[PDB]
Design a protein around this ligand. Sequence first.
Ligand SMILES: *[C@@H]1O[C@H](CO)[C@@H](O)[C@H](O)[C@@H]1O
Ligand SMILES: *[C@H]1O[C@H](CO)[C@@H](O)[C@H](O)[C@@H]1O
Ligand SMILES: *[C@H]1O[C@H](CO)[C@@H](O)[C@H](O)[C@@H]1O
Ligand SMILES: *[C@H]1O[C@H](CO)[C@@H](O)[C@H](O)[C@@H]1O
Lengths: 222, 226
Amino acid sequence: DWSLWSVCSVTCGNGNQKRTRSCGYACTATESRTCDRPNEDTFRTAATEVSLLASCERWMSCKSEFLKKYMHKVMNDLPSCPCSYPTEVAYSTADIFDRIKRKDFRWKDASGPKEKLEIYKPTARYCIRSMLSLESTTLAAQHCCYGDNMQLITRGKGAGTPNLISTEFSAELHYKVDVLPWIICKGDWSRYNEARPPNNGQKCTESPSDEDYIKQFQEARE
Amino acid sequence: DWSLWSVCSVTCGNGNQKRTRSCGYACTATESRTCDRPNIEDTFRTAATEVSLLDTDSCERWMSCKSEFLKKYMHKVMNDLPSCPCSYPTEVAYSTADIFDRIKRKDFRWKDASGPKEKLEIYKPTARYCIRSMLSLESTTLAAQHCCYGDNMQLITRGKGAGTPNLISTEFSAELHYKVDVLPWIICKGDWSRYNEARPPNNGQKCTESPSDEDYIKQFQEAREY
Ligand SMILES: *[C@@H]1O[C@H](CO)[C@@H](O)[C@H](O)[C@@H]1O
Ligand SMILES: *[C@H]1O[C@H](CO)[C@@H](O)[C@H](O)[C@@H]1O
Ligand SMILES: *[C@H]1O[C@H](CO)[C@@H](O)[C@H](O)[C@@H]1O
Ligand SMILES: *[C@H]1O[C@H](CO)[C@@H](O)[C@H](O)[C@@H]1O
């Protein structure tokens, strides 16, 4: 039978709410929905540490003090990736608590058509994206992509590469900062992923496997 | 309609398959199923030696079981197990770390029990983090100390989100642990006060009681409705 609907996860904002239908033997049905409660963030937060606080080879050899410092702090703020696909993000928009950054972070499903998974992350099956917090230190957004078994793909052509600019701030600025260099360097993930390092904060098992990672490398260098 | 079954989560081990399904607006329905593949080292060794060498309500009947095995085993469980730490061991957020029990004067290994498969939202709705003790090579039982903590990282001694010891750990079996340490708790409709008197939370280090007297009482009238 059914079970309880949980609590609306937040009062001072907008949250999520989950139920455990919990079916029969060796099976467990759950179900999640987002809930609403009342109460100049995207364009007036990073501007405080920027506006006043101030070919493929030439790109990934750029030692800009702005770009370097920003990227450092990006990895010193962004949450980890989930070790598994948060199923409750398929049709809803889910909330995950990063145990390392000790905070709640909001995630939208980035497996849509405008993502074009067959193009950018051709190993993956699903992708998810961090969302600009109300107290976001940056305009960034953790990207994470998963496989057919729903586990995180750590290294390679389809992996969670942090995006300097999120689609919430701008889908075109993101595309021309976090994708335009990736298409310049002909899909060479090994050339891209060293400048834009994927993230495995919760330290999940490495994938694709050692042998299969290498076959990818020798194909991606041609 | 529904969606895919998805692939077994692991081949070199034992995993699951999860299925999503069209829900309502801003909802997401899902369901999980178990999957088995061959490769439980010391689980079926030290325990098996300790096992063989030893107008009516269902929840009442469970809490009315005078099994000499159950009572004897439980006594030695609350003697093998370590005390709960007063605070949250930060370094465990990944998965695992080793801390030292002052009472037992020994090291014990702990795993982070704060995942989504846990659903802290439901089973320990006060708590923010949870951790469980791990089956030591010299463990006398299949049990495991559960301890759940709060926003301020401190142990929640009483109430709906508390460290209720598990007679059977996930390491030995996830299904037998469910059907011994969770199934009666589901039976006794989320009644922590009914459950916890028979499966008593532990505060061996005698940290400050939490939640406070004021809020603990607020929990009384609420939690015995749902
Ligand atoms: C789900 O919730 C309960 C079952 O536990 C009932 O009110 C009803 O069957 C509903 O479908
Ligand atoms: C969830 O389910 C129904 C609403 O659809 C109610 O019984 C109650 O709100 C519960 O929390
Ligand atoms: C459930 O419904 C049908 C299968 O009977 C399909 O549209 C699809 O496979 C979905 O999972
Ligand atoms: C089960 O669900 C459908 C088959 O109807 C597919 O998504 C897949 O083969 C899965 O195992």
